[PDB]
Homo-oligomer: A and B are copies of this chain.
Amino acid sequence: SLRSMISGLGDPLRDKNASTFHWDRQLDDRQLLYAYRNSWVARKAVTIPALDAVRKWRDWQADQKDISRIEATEKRLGLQQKLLQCKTLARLWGGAAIVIGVKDQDMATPFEPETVNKDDLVYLTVMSRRELSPEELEQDPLDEFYARPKRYQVSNGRNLSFVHPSRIVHQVGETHPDPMLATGVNVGWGDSTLQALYDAMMNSDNTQANIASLVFEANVDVIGLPDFMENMSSEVYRQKLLDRFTLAAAGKGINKTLMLDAEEVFTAHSRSFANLDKIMEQFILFVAGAADIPLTRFLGQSPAGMSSTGQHDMKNYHDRIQSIQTLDLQPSMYRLDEAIIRSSLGARPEELFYIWSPLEQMSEKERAEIGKLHAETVNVIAGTGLFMQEELREVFGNQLVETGLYPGLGDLLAQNGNELPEWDLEQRSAEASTKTAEAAAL
- CB-nearest residue of chain B relative to A297? B316
Interface centre among A43, A202, A283 (most CB of B within 10 A): A202
Tell me if A211 and B218 are in contact (CB < 8 A).
yes
Tell me if B254 and A351 are in contact (CB < 8 A).
no
Size class of the A contact interface (CB-based, 8 Å): 35 or more
Bound CA span A220–B250, Å: 12
A104 on interface, CB distance cutoff 8 Å: no
Q: Distance in Å from the Cβ of A228 to the closest Cβ of chain B?
A: 4
Bound CA span A174–B42, Å: 14
- CB-nearest residue of chain B relative to A323? B55
- Chain B residues with CB under 8 Å of A278's CB are 277
* CB under 8 Å from chain B, chain A span 176-229: 176-178, 181, 191, 195-200, 202-203, 205-229
- CB-nearest residue of chain B relative to A386? B393
- Chain B residues with CB under 8 Å of A29's CB are none
A109 on interface, CB distance cutoff 8 Å: no
A 294-308 binary contact with B (CB < 8 Å = 1; else 0) = 111111111111111
Could you list 7 further interchain pairs (A-B, Cβ under 8 angstroms) beyond the known A268-B271, A422-B430, A436-B438?
Answer: A18-B202, A40-B199, A51-B327, A125-B142, A214-B218, A318-B361, A391-B415
Pick 30 A–B contacts, CB within 8 A, sort by A.
A4-B21, A7-B20, A16-B213, A17-B206, A18-B212, A22-B31, A22-B34, A23-B39, A37-B191, A37-B195, A40-B200, A43-B174, A62-B408, A127-B141, A223-B259, A225-B262, A228-B260, A262-B265, A277-B279, A296-B301, A301-B314, A303-B304, A305-B307, A309-B309, A309-B313, A351-B410, A372-B373, A379-B384, A395-B409, A426-B431
